């Protein structure tokens, strides 16, 4: 889904993922939990309403 | 008759031409080639000469 491509110089990145229309999908969904699967099987992210 | 004005002379010269030092410069282009610098990046660059 989301691919990160970095230069040969960059070795540390800290990303902030934000769900902006979560107030909209609240009118449609009862529970929504997004799990962001990291590089090699790690799971580093969790997003909910 | 002749009342010799007893005054003989000796002389010399000194030649100061150059300044002590020559600062030969080879400027650096630090991102260089076959390497890369990114915004917010951290590291070290070195030019030996
Ligand atoms: Ca670096």
Is there a contact between B44 and A11 (Cβ–Cβ < 8 Å)? no
Q: How many helices (H) and strands (E) does chain B have?
A: 0, 0
Residue with structure tokens 């491509």? A5
Secondary structure of residue A23 in the 3-state scheme: helix
B9-43: b (≥16 Cβ within 10 Å) or e: eeeeeeeeeeeeeeeeeeeeeeeeeeeeeeeeeee
Task: Return the H-helix or E-strand segment holding A44.
Answer: strand A43-48
How many CA within 13 A on the CB side of residue B5? 3
Chain A closest CA to B31's CA: distance in Å? 10
Cα dihedral sign for A19, A23, A26, A28? negative
Bridge partners (DSSP) listed for residue A34: A47
How far apart CA A8 and CA B41 sit, in angstroms, is 11
C-alpha pair distances (Å), B46 with each of B1, B29, B32? 85, 10, 11
How far apart CA A4 and CA A6 sit, in angstroms, is 6
Provide the CA A41 distance to its chain's centre, in angstroms.
15
Residue with structure tokens 């008759």? B1
The resolution of the experimental structure, rounded to one decimal in Å, is 3.5
Chain B closest CA to A45's CA: distance in Å? 24
Please name which of A15, A11, A10 lies closest in space to residue B38, comparing C-alpha atoms. Answer: A10
Give Rg (Cα) of chain B.
31
Experimental technique used? Answer: cryo-EM
CA–centroid distance, B34 to ligand 1, in Å, is 14
């Amino acid at each position: 889904w989301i691919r990160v491509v970095n230069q040969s110089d960059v070795e540390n990145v800290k990303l902030e993922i934000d769900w902006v229309n979560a107030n909209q999908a609240a009118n449609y969904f009862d529970y929504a939990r997004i799990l962001v699967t990291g590089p090699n099987g790690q799971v580093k992210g969790y997003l909910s309403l | 008759s002749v009342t010799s004005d007893r005054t003989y002379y000796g002389y010399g010269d000194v030649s100061v031409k150059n300044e002590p030092v020559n600062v030969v410069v080879s400027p650096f282009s630090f991102p260089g080639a076959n390497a890369s610098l990114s915004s917010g990046g951290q590291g070290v660059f070195k030019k030996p000469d």
